[PDB]
Design a protein around this nucleic acid. Sequence first.
RNA 1: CCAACUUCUUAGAGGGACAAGUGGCGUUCAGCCACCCGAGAUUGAGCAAUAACAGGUCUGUGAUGCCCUUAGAUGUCCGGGGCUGCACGCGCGCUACACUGACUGGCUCAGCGUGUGCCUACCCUACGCCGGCAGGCGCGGGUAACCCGUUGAACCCCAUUCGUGAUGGGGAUCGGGGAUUGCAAUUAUUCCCCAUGAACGAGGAAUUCCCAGUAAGUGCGGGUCAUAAGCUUGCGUUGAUUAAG
Lengths: 146, 73, 64, 145, 67, 189, 57, 143, 52
Amino acid sequence: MPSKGPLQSVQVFGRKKTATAVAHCKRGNGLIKVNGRPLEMIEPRTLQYKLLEPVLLLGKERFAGVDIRVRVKGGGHVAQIYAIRQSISKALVAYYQKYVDEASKKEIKDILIQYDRTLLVADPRRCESKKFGGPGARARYQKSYR
Amino acid sequence: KLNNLVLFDKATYDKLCKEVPNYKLITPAVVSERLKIRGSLARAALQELLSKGLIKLVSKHRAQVIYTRNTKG
Amino acid sequence: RVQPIKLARVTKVLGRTGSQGQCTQVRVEFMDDTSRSIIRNVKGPVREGDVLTLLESEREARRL
Amino acid sequence: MSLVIPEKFQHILRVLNTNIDGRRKIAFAITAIKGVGRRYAHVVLRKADIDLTKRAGELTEDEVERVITIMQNPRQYKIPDWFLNRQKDVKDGKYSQVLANGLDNKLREDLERLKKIRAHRGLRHFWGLRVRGQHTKTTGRRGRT
Amino acid sequence: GRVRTKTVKKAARVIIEKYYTRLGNDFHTNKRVCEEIAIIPSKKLRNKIAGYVTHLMKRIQRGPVRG
Amino acid sequence: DIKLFGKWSTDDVQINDISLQDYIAVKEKYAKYLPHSAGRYAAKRFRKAQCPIVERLTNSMMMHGRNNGKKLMTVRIVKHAFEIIHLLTGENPLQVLVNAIINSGPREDSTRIGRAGTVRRQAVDVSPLRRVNQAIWLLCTGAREAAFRNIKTIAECLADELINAAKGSSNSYAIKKKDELERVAKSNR
Amino acid sequence: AVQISKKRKFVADGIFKAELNEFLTRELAEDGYSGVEVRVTPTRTEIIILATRTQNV
Amino acid sequence: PGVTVKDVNQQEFVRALAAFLKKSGKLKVPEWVDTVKLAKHKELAPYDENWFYTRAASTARHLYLRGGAGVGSMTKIYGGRQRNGVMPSHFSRGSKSVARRVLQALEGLKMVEKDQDGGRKLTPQGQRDLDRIAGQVAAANKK
Amino acid sequence: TPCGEGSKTWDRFQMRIHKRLIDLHSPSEIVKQITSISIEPGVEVEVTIADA
RNA sequence: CCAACUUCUUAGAGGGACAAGUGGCGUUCAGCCACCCGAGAUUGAGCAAUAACAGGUCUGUGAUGCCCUUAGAUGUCCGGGGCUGCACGCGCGCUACACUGACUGGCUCAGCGUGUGCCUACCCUACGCCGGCAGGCGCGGGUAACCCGUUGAACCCCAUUCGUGAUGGGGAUCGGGGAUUGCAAUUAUUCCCCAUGAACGAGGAAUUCCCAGUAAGUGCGGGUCAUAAGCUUGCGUUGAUUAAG
Ligand SMILES: [Mg+2]
Ligand SMILES: [Mg+2]
């Protein structure tokens, strides 16, 4: 039903080493999930306070006008939860760069930067390939002499 | 020092339910060296003191089951 | 022998020593007057502006 | 519900020739029977319709005798044919699960039968050498002087 | 590990000595100048010339260096 | 305000000894929710100082191959052992760990390549990062050779050794081995 | 016959270029050969020599 | 309100449906169900006694996520780590003719149906009753 | 190494072919004036069937 | 046309960082030290000089000089044996030596890449149905971003069983049986089952490899291939203590 104010919605991602994960954060009422299931029912569950972490220190009721859902492709069990974290870190930032003023973008980015300059900035380091004489990316095979 | 007596005698069980709910670090690897039981009854006896209501659960973890004494406050 | 074991803040890093770079050289100050100083040698990374602890105050200067 | 102990407790049992220890549970105590391993044990205890949880010192001779009977011959009690030890034995043709010292009867019986007709593998058991196609230039040293 | 090679310092002396009045103390201005005025093969040595240019746009604007 | 593992705010922990203030990092700027941070700590030095000690201690716990990449099993050991601390004392468990940094960090240790006073010759002092670096390591190794051929769980044995080192009564290994290095450095002080 | 895959198309015409290079080097050694260039057409196809002496070739 | 399987603890949803098919005894239990070893990459008999029911739950639960998974697609998901001892370990297939029996066990239970291609999807009779007991187990968390 | 002696070197000849794609609805007599317009040895273009 | 669009996928051009800005240094020289902006303020490898070693390879090569051998052939086909034999020593490498573990059952997330032939005949496999496993038959797709295939990998995680025992740790050794490969498995090709259960309880003198996605645990993928990986070469996951001398 495309009637009343459709598609007031930015789509913002987050990557770490393969795991790209994108939030299609619409206008709605307090709904965050990954692939349909809610946040607290996730695979790690020992890291259950670093994938709903930005909704903790920034707010539930401040950030309950949205119907975030995230699909995930790539990565691993530590990669994908930082990826959806980075997805819901900077999506509601970029929801605030456009559909309101930068008074609220300055309000939340200033929290997100001063704590872990890595919630919303991409991870630079990557796989860094093997070499042709050793077992790993730096090491060599064991040298013998006699 | 080995095969230390699964399936309690009567000389240890009357000591167990005397003060093992009383102290606070109630853990299977502690009650199996402070007593002379070899454990996996350490897991068995601890579950039924939780079943009676002498002790309280904290962990519910697979590698570490943590309990405490009764609230005497 | 019986002395209060004393915390101490450094002046400038004066370079490595100890034939392998495993000692540094810090020349601490003894927390009370700014003129009482002794040249010393600690091991561990420095970060100028720290406070290290002296087991005793009268040992040796590093000069042969 | 076993919380202290009953009045009786087989301190060490005695089954056929290998006395199983009384303070393990059943599937891991009867492994000492050379012919009942750890994997063969669980099928015995579940075709007997006994309970798998109890230790060794708390089964009386009613239940043990049904455990002893079906592991004495597993064939006629609905245990499949490619699960046994001496499948298609070369003196009978049948399927004969040996348990006791009879397992050591038929073990040497392979060695002496091959030693009698002078095959290659009969020579390798006779010699102080490996059998199953292993190299011996730089492995298998402490089995010799 | 920073110190720029001679073929940067040789090619960025003839820029500043011959085109002094077309230049100034902003980097992004000078990057388009050498883009247009000297045939540079790739970008990586291009702006590395222009780094020494602005470094000497703040140098010979004060003193008489070999200019 | 930070609720370390969902609980035990970093407000009450008073860093008291002045030699070891700005190298212990449970401070309000540098308190996290739980110790699992994307590191980047050995590209340039001296940013592994303001890293919170809860991060450093859980990283230095998995050592020997079969426990080498396993980080979300070595953090629940810190999550359980802080909780057992609250059983034995009823304390904000961060405060009792930083006293274990205080009471197990050495002061004196010997350095010389060649001929021997003990193996080294010359005892020197310690910068107030290296004795903290040796503080988090002495708690792990002192917990590790008391849980190897022992029925005791490593989460108990961690929780046993550090608060016994935090008081300090020559019972945990981080007191009886640390004072060995200080005494043999006094043998050639 | 029926057609074959793309990664072995590209070593087919690669090994086609390598072989007539080796033959014409042995064939045109005394005439200043200096390589060949191929053109593939779906008609009469088209190859050239780069010979120094266009007499003896 | 509207409750799916997805918003529910799917670890103990397995126990929610292993309790379900055991009590509603229409399921087809094979005769060899205790001499199995379960998918040769592991070397002991299964510790649970009614393991065939809790294996029948997950092959319904995995089928609700992705459609159309045949027998070989469902073998290679229950595979694990085969320790060959002194040689290094590997990954390996499950067992087809225990995955084939259990998918034929839901066949007579009428939760599953064959496909246009090869493979099996679960019929919407299968999705209407496991989400109801997903609603039953969700309200069991709060009570 | 053409022998077995050396110090364990390993060179990596890698070949990377690219590919693009274009549709047509057009009649295919003038498919012949798509083909014969460049001599161009460095292309490998293919003609998809016009049976539709 | 019975919808648009490019954030995520694929690339294509171009833009992007230069030590530019701010301070302290030094001959206000080249530059160094951190800070601010920033995705990033050392991404990692390929190629690589002059002059040489009596380095190795004549068993890659109809590259090759000379010598030797030339039909009772060092040519070459055919069957069998050996290239694998064991009082001993040496070098790479896997598994381990548990409780941070191991079982059993659940929950689970990837990248790199290969695939049917002029010769040479035999590939990737989905599915269906027979087997407690290894497997077997019919039906298909794929010359491939078109099919295998969103590559449901392992570690992990939660759930149970086991408790410091040479034990359910270890699985060498070794018996019997079952299938697949092929012209042939015997001197065990490989795979599977049941049974057997050795040292091994953290390692002498000495020594290697490496400092950021790095060491390492952890699997998958090529290459050799009919059967074939404890090897090698690539891949991703997990992921560090210590160092700036
Ligand atoms: Mg132990
Ligand atoms: Mg040759």
